[PDB]
């Protein structure tokens, strides 16, 4: 592919290394997003290896709830990623606009998330930064995991890297322990709470107080939450990684079953 | 902004695409890609013959 295979429509957003454009591939008139990255900026920042790893991971995943990277190409100055267009845009914007999601919307997102994450884990990919800002939304509002920045393929070894986002950090990262794929189970629980409440569960005035709340699992449920939703969150936000509810458990949880209105997109044929 | 990319023509084309998915695996996934280790190296132009 080259840039002249596409009609450029309009900017969708400014990334750190270039813009993302709404584009239409000329030959099939197929609408996609083209993410443009400047090679010199990437090299200056020293992110080449990180970018390679992110592309290597995202470009080999095929799931309805993971944003697809169809292909990629480069020219003299730019690297171009050909991505699935998410017509309903950023999840975080929707949550901010509404303040909190209702149970139906939240359960639906949870089922989609757990399915995408299970797909990942079956391939020994750990995501490591699930939060609303890393999620986009499809035509029917389907969750799409979009940012694989912190992800890793971890076939054998446990990991040590502190990664993710303050409010979402699992206790084991804060304590300097090794971690595994169960980090994603914890983050799923933080996400479910934020969806329903509109604030993450360990919100605090300082980074040290947030860490303290996390490692103590100082979870205080607002009285408006349903017993089912509290049950799921409680089962994900376990101090001990091995005790967290598995992703198949999230999919099977009664609150998810009773409230989710998940619909699988049409597929070719 | 070209017309295809705004308001209604866009809305309409997105709907159309959701319900008539293309064989992306074939249409994009069989097409060659640059090696990852070559992304930061020399871009060679598409055409060179004499
Ligand atoms: N596939 C997409 N479909 C629709 N909008 C997109 C898509 N990808 C990116 N965008 C929009 O483009 C914006 C910036 O792109 P993104 O890849 O997120 O960079 P960012 O969010 O600024 N983070 P980074 O690129 O890491 O700085 C996003 O916030 C979206 O609003």
Short mmCIF file of C-alpha atoms and ligand atoms in Angstrom, two decimals:
data_model
loop_
_atom_site.label_atom_id
_atom_site.label_comp_id
_atom_site.label_asym_id
_atom_site.label_seq_id
_atom_site.Cartn_x
_atom_site.Cartn_y
_atom_site.Cartn_z
CA UNK A 1 0.00 0.00 0.00
CA UNK A 2 0.83 3.73 -0.43
CA UNK A 3 -0.75 6.97 0.63
CA UNK A 4 -2.12 7.45 -2.84
CA UNK A 5 -4.34 4.32 -2.39
CA UNK A 6 -6.56 6.42 -0.07
CA UNK A 7 -8.81 9.43 -0.21
CA UNK A 8 -8.19 11.38 2.95
CA UNK A 9 -11.36 12.58 4.52
CA UNK A 10 -10.68 14.60 7.65
CA UNK A 11 -8.60 14.45 10.89
CA UNK A 12 -10.08 12.22 13.67
CA UNK A 13 -7.52 13.20 16.23
CA UNK A 14 -3.96 14.25 17.03
CA UNK A 15 -1.71 11.58 18.31
CA UNK A 16 1.71 12.13 19.86
CA UNK A 17 3.51 11.28 16.63
CA UNK A 18 1.05 12.47 14.00
CA UNK A 19 -2.54 12.58 13.20
CA UNK A 20 -5.22 9.99 12.67
CA UNK A 21 -7.34 10.49 9.61
CA UNK A 22 -10.63 9.23 8.39
CA UNK A 23 -9.76 7.68 5.09
CA UNK A 24 -11.31 5.66 2.31
CA UNK A 25 -9.30 3.02 0.47
CA UNK A 26 -9.87 3.90 -3.21
CA UNK A 27 -10.22 0.52 -4.85
CA UNK A 28 -12.90 -0.97 -2.46
CA UNK A 29 -14.28 2.40 -1.16
CA UNK A 30 -13.68 0.95 2.33
CA UNK A 31 -13.66 3.44 5.20
CA UNK A 32 -10.89 3.05 7.76
CA UNK A 33 -8.68 5.21 10.01
CA UNK A 34 -5.11 5.93 8.94
CA UNK A 35 -2.72 6.64 11.78
CA UNK A 36 0.31 8.64 10.66
CA UNK A 37 3.53 8.51 12.56
CA UNK A 38 6.67 10.64 11.76
CA UNK A 39 9.78 8.55 11.64
CA UNK A 40 12.16 11.33 12.88
CA UNK A 41 9.98 12.04 15.92
CA UNK A 42 9.79 8.33 16.73
CA UNK A 43 13.57 8.01 16.51
CA UNK A 44 14.20 11.18 18.54
CA UNK A 45 12.00 9.88 21.33
CA UNK A 46 13.66 6.45 21.14
CA UNK A 47 10.37 4.56 20.70
CA UNK A 48 11.23 2.38 17.71
CA UNK A 49 11.37 -0.90 19.59
CA UNK A 50 8.22 -0.11 21.56
CA UNK A 51 6.38 0.69 18.35
CA UNK A 52 7.55 -2.47 16.67
CA UNK A 53 6.34 -4.57 19.59
CA UNK A 54 2.90 -2.80 19.64
CA UNK A 55 2.42 -3.37 15.93
CA UNK A 56 3.61 -7.00 16.18
CA UNK A 57 0.95 -7.61 18.86
CA UNK A 58 -2.01 -5.68 17.42
CA UNK A 59 -1.52 -6.76 13.83
CA UNK A 60 -1.90 -10.47 14.72
CA UNK A 61 -5.11 -10.13 16.77
CA UNK A 62 -8.49 -10.76 15.16
CA UNK A 63 -11.48 -10.31 17.45
CA UNK A 64 -14.72 -8.23 17.17
CA UNK A 65 -13.83 -6.35 20.35
CA UNK A 66 -10.20 -5.61 19.50
CA UNK A 67 -9.55 -2.75 17.10
CA UNK A 68 -8.21 -4.41 13.89
CA UNK A 69 -5.00 -3.33 12.19
CA UNK A 70 -5.55 -4.30 8.65
CA UNK A 71 -1.98 -3.64 7.37
CA UNK A 72 0.69 -0.91 7.48
CA UNK A 73 3.20 0.78 5.15
CA UNK A 74 5.78 3.51 5.13
CA UNK A 75 7.15 6.26 2.97
CA UNK A 76 10.20 8.50 3.19
CA UNK A 77 9.04 10.35 6.33
CA UNK A 78 6.00 8.52 7.76
CA UNK A 79 4.78 5.16 9.02
CA UNK A 80 1.10 4.58 8.33
CA UNK A 81 -1.14 2.15 10.28
CA UNK A 82 -4.34 1.01 8.59
CA UNK A 83 -6.87 0.64 11.45
CA UNK A 84 -10.49 -0.23 11.80
CA UNK A 85 -12.58 2.92 12.06
CA UNK A 86 -14.56 3.17 15.35
CA UNK A 87 -17.51 5.31 14.37
CA UNK A 88 -18.74 6.05 17.87
CA UNK A 89 -15.28 7.22 18.95
CA UNK A 90 -13.68 7.32 22.41
CA UNK A 91 -15.31 5.46 25.28
CA UNK A 92 -13.91 7.92 27.79
CA UNK A 93 -15.83 10.77 26.12
CA UNK A 94 -19.08 8.89 26.46
CA UNK A 95 -18.47 8.10 30.13
CA UNK A 96 -17.57 11.78 30.80
CA UNK A 97 -20.68 12.97 28.96
CA UNK A 98 -23.01 10.62 30.92
CA UNK A 99 -21.11 10.69 34.22
CA UNK A 100 -21.82 6.96 34.72
CA UNK A 101 -23.18 4.12 32.66
CA UNK A 102 -26.24 2.12 33.55
CA UNK A 103 -26.10 -1.54 34.32
CA UNK A 104 -27.03 -2.66 30.82
CA UNK A 105 -24.34 -0.63 29.13
CA UNK A 106 -21.76 -1.62 31.77
CA UNK A 107 -22.53 -5.34 31.67
CA UNK A 108 -22.41 -5.30 27.88
CA UNK A 109 -18.98 -3.66 27.90
CA UNK A 110 -17.82 -6.16 30.50
CA UNK A 111 -18.82 -9.14 28.48
CA UNK A 112 -17.06 -7.74 25.37
CA UNK A 113 -13.97 -6.86 27.35
CA UNK A 114 -13.71 -10.26 28.98
CA UNK A 115 -14.14 -11.98 25.61
CA UNK A 116 -11.38 -9.84 24.01
CA UNK A 117 -9.10 -10.33 26.99
CA UNK A 118 -9.71 -14.10 26.98
CA UNK A 119 -8.72 -14.11 23.27
CA UNK A 120 -5.55 -12.27 24.28
CA UNK A 121 -4.72 -14.54 27.18
CA UNK A 122 -5.26 -17.72 25.07
CA UNK A 123 -2.28 -16.31 23.04
CA UNK A 124 -0.30 -15.34 26.15
CA UNK A 125 -0.74 -11.64 25.45
CA UNK A 126 -1.22 -9.49 28.56
CA UNK A 127 -2.78 -6.11 27.92
CA UNK A 128 -1.67 -4.28 31.08
CA UNK A 129 -3.49 -1.02 30.58
CA UNK A 130 -7.17 -1.51 30.50
CA UNK A 131 -8.97 1.76 31.25
CA UNK A 132 -11.68 3.72 29.48
CA UNK A 133 -9.25 5.95 27.55
CA UNK A 134 -7.83 2.83 25.79
CA UNK A 135 -11.24 1.77 24.44
CA UNK A 136 -13.12 2.88 21.30
CA UNK A 137 -16.67 2.14 20.22
CA UNK A 138 -18.10 0.47 17.14
CA UNK A 139 -21.16 1.31 15.04
CA UNK A 140 -23.50 -0.42 17.48
CA UNK A 141 -21.45 0.83 20.47
CA UNK A 142 -19.36 -2.34 20.69
CA UNK A 143 -16.25 -2.05 22.81
CA UNK A 144 -12.99 -2.06 20.93
CA UNK A 145 -9.64 -2.41 22.70
CA UNK A 146 -7.63 0.12 20.84
CA UNK A 147 -4.29 0.90 22.65
CA UNK A 148 -1.72 -1.94 23.09
CA UNK A 149 1.05 0.36 24.33
CA UNK A 150 1.83 -1.57 27.49
CA UNK A 151 0.95 -5.05 26.12
CA UNK A 152 3.42 -7.93 26.16
CA UNK A 153 3.63 -11.44 24.82
CA UNK A 154 4.68 -13.41 27.91
CA UNK A 155 4.77 -17.08 27.08
CA UNK A 156 6.84 -18.31 30.03
CA UNK A 157 8.28 -15.81 32.43
CA UNK A 158 6.61 -13.64 34.99
CA UNK A 159 7.00 -9.89 34.46
CA UNK A 160 8.46 -7.06 36.60
CA UNK A 161 7.58 -3.81 34.78
CA UNK A 162 5.51 -1.21 36.56
CA UNK A 163 3.07 -0.28 34.00
CA UNK A 164 -0.44 0.99 33.42
CA UNK A 165 -2.18 3.90 34.96
CA UNK A 166 -2.21 4.95 38.67
CA UNK A 167 -5.86 4.29 39.51
CA UNK A 168 -5.74 0.95 37.75
CA UNK A 169 -2.48 -0.47 39.19
CA UNK A 170 -2.80 -3.88 40.78
CA UNK A 171 -1.37 -4.41 44.28
CA UNK A 172 1.40 -6.67 42.96
CA UNK A 173 2.81 -3.94 40.74
CA UNK A 174 2.81 -1.43 43.59
CA UNK A 175 4.54 -3.93 45.88
CA UNK A 176 7.31 -4.71 43.35
CA UNK A 177 6.28 -8.35 42.98
CA UNK A 178 6.43 -10.23 39.69
CA UNK A 179 3.13 -10.19 37.76
CA UNK A 180 1.33 -12.33 35.18
CA UNK A 181 -1.87 -12.16 33.15
CA UNK A 182 -4.00 -11.79 36.20
CA UNK A 183 -3.18 -8.05 36.21
CA UNK A 184 -5.83 -7.77 33.50
CA UNK A 185 -8.47 -9.36 35.86
CA UNK A 186 -7.79 -6.68 38.40
CA UNK A 187 -7.97 -3.88 35.87
CA UNK A 188 -11.29 -5.30 34.56
CA UNK A 189 -12.68 -4.89 38.06
CA UNK A 190 -11.52 -1.31 38.39
CA UNK A 191 -13.08 -0.63 34.98
CA UNK A 192 -16.45 -2.16 35.90
CA UNK A 193 -16.53 0.06 39.08
CA UNK A 194 -15.63 3.20 37.10
CA UNK A 195 -18.27 2.43 34.46
CA UNK A 196 -21.00 2.20 37.12
CA UNK A 197 -19.79 4.90 39.50
CA UNK A 198 -17.97 7.33 37.16
CA UNK A 199 -14.86 7.49 39.41
CA UNK A 200 -12.23 4.75 40.00
CA UNK A 201 -12.56 2.91 43.36
CA UNK A 202 -9.24 4.12 44.98
CA UNK A 203 -9.38 7.79 43.95
CA UNK A 204 -7.26 9.87 46.32
CA UNK A 205 -5.64 13.25 46.69
CA UNK A 206 -2.05 11.78 46.35
CA UNK A 207 -0.24 8.95 44.64
CA UNK A 208 0.83 7.48 48.01
CA UNK A 209 -2.69 7.48 49.38
CA UNK A 210 -4.03 5.85 46.19
CA UNK A 211 -1.28 3.15 46.48
CA UNK A 212 -2.29 2.57 50.12
CA UNK A 213 -5.94 2.17 49.22
CA UNK A 214 -5.05 -0.30 46.44
CA UNK A 215 -2.77 -2.55 48.46
CA UNK A 216 -5.32 -2.64 51.26
CA UNK A 217 -8.16 -3.18 48.75
CA UNK A 218 -10.03 -0.33 50.41
CA UNK A 219 -13.17 -0.75 48.34
CA UNK A 220 -16.17 1.36 49.45
CA UNK A 221 -19.26 0.65 47.34
CA UNK A 222 -21.75 3.47 46.81
CA UNK A 223 -25.18 2.51 48.00
CA UNK A 224 -26.76 2.85 44.51
CA UNK A 225 -24.91 -0.23 43.10
CA UNK A 226 -26.79 -3.46 42.66
CA UNK A 227 -25.84 -6.54 44.61
CA UNK A 228 -24.92 -8.29 41.34
CA UNK A 229 -22.57 -5.56 40.17
CA UNK A 230 -20.87 -5.47 43.64
CA UNK A 231 -20.55 -9.23 43.49
CA UNK A 232 -18.66 -9.13 40.19
CA UNK A 233 -16.44 -6.24 41.15
CA UNK A 234 -15.60 -7.88 44.49
CA UNK A 235 -14.64 -11.08 42.80
CA UNK A 236 -12.27 -9.33 40.39
CA UNK A 237 -10.65 -6.91 42.93
CA UNK A 238 -8.91 -9.65 44.97
CA UNK A 239 -5.59 -8.92 46.56
CA UNK A 240 -4.25 -12.36 45.67
CA UNK A 241 -3.98 -12.79 41.85
CA UNK A 242 -4.90 -16.49 41.85
CA UNK A 243 -8.14 -15.75 43.63
CA UNK A 244 -9.49 -13.34 41.04
CA UNK A 245 -12.48 -14.41 38.96
CA UNK A 246 -11.34 -15.77 35.64
CA UNK A 247 -12.36 -14.08 32.44
CA UNK A 248 -14.66 -16.98 31.53
CA UNK A 249 -16.14 -16.38 34.98
CA UNK A 250 -16.82 -12.76 34.15
CA UNK A 251 -18.64 -13.86 30.89
CA UNK A 252 -20.69 -16.44 32.91
CA UNK A 253 -21.41 -14.17 35.85
CA UNK A 254 -25.16 -13.89 36.51
CA UNK A 255 -25.12 -10.08 36.53
CA UNK A 256 -23.44 -10.11 33.12
CA UNK A 257 -25.91 -12.66 31.82
CA UNK A 258 -28.92 -10.72 33.12
CA UNK A 259 -27.88 -7.31 31.93
CA UNK A 260 -25.63 -7.64 28.85
CA UNK A 261 -27.15 -6.91 25.40
CA UNK A 262 -23.98 -7.84 23.53
CA UNK A 263 -24.37 -8.25 19.75
CA UNK A 264 -21.65 -9.71 17.52
CA UNK A 265 -21.02 -7.62 14.41
CA UNK A 266 -21.82 -9.16 11.02
CA UNK A 267 -18.88 -10.96 9.47
CA UNK A 268 -17.98 -11.77 5.87
CA UNK A 269 -19.85 -13.69 4.35
CA UNK B 1 -13.91 18.12 3.77
CA UNK B 2 -14.96 16.00 0.86
CA UNK B 3 -18.63 15.14 0.85
CA UNK B 4 -18.22 11.35 1.48
CA UNK B 5 -16.66 12.21 4.83
CA UNK B 6 -19.33 14.30 6.55
CA UNK B 7 -22.75 14.06 8.16
CA UNK B 8 -25.10 12.00 6.05
CA UNK B 9 -23.16 10.44 3.20
CA UNK B 10 -20.74 9.27 5.92
CA UNK B 11 -23.47 7.96 8.27
CA UNK B 12 -24.99 6.14 5.40
CA UNK B 13 -21.71 4.60 4.21
CA UNK B 14 -20.77 3.41 7.72
CA UNK B 15 -24.15 1.63 8.10
CA UNK B 16 -23.70 0.14 4.73
CA UNK B 17 -20.27 -1.15 5.66
CA UNK B 18 -21.41 -2.62 9.05
CA UNK B 19 -24.05 -4.75 7.30
CA UNK B 20 -21.99 -5.64 4.24
CA UNK B 21 -18.58 -6.53 5.69
CA UNK B 22 -15.80 -7.07 3.24
CA UNK B 23 -13.42 -10.00 3.33
CA UNK B 24 -10.72 -8.00 5.08
CA UNK B 25 -8.54 -11.05 5.77
CA UNK B 26 -8.17 -11.57 2.02
CA UNK B 27 -8.42 -7.95 0.86
CA UNK B 28 -5.86 -6.57 3.34
CA UNK B 29 -4.37 -9.64 5.12
CA UNK B 30 -2.97 -11.23 1.97
CA UNK B 31 -1.34 -7.99 0.85
CA UNK B 32 2.34 -7.66 1.49
CA UNK B 33 3.66 -5.48 4.26
CA UNK B 34 7.10 -3.99 5.03
CA UNK B 35 9.16 -6.05 7.43
CA UNK B 36 8.99 -4.57 10.89
CA UNK B 37 12.79 -4.32 11.01
CA UNK B 38 12.63 -2.17 7.86
CA UNK B 39 10.11 0.39 8.99
CA UNK B 40 12.74 2.93 9.99
CA UNK B 41 14.97 2.20 7.02
CA UNK B 42 14.89 3.26 3.44
CA UNK B 43 11.59 3.79 1.68
CA UNK B 44 11.99 2.55 -1.87
CA UNK B 45 9.57 3.92 -4.41
CA UNK B 46 6.83 1.64 -5.93
CA UNK B 47 8.01 2.07 -9.53
CA UNK B 48 11.45 1.70 -10.99
CA UNK B 49 11.85 0.50 -14.56
CA UNK B 50 13.62 1.83 -17.68
N1 LIG C 1 -9.50 3.87 14.77
C1 LIG C 1 -10.01 4.99 15.14
N2 LIG C 1 -11.30 5.26 14.84
C2 LIG C 1 -11.83 6.50 15.21
N3 LIG C 1 -11.04 7.47 15.87
C3 LIG C 1 -9.77 7.10 16.12
C4 LIG C 1 -9.26 5.90 15.76
N4 LIG C 1 -7.99 5.85 16.17
C5 LIG C 1 -7.75 7.04 16.74
N5 LIG C 1 -8.84 7.82 16.73
C6 LIG C 1 -9.05 9.19 17.22
O1 LIG C 1 -7.70 9.76 17.05
C7 LIG C 1 -7.30 10.24 18.41
C8 LIG C 1 -5.79 10.13 18.72
O2 LIG C 1 -5.44 8.82 18.34
P1 LIG C 1 -4.65 7.74 19.28
O3 LIG C 1 -4.25 6.49 18.49
O4 LIG C 1 -5.46 7.50 20.49
O5 LIG C 1 -3.59 8.70 19.88
P2 LIG C 1 -3.92 9.29 21.42
O6 LIG C 1 -5.20 8.82 21.99
O7 LIG C 1 -3.67 10.77 21.42
N6 LIG C 1 -2.73 8.49 22.13
P3 LIG C 1 -1.20 8.46 21.25
O8 LIG C 1 -1.45 8.24 19.79
O9 LIG C 1 -0.75 7.30 22.06
O10 LIG C 1 -0.85 9.83 21.69
C9 LIG C 1 -8.10 9.31 19.36
O11 LIG C 1 -8.27 9.88 20.62
C10 LIG C 1 -9.45 9.20 18.73
O12 LIG C 1 -10.25 10.25 19.15
#
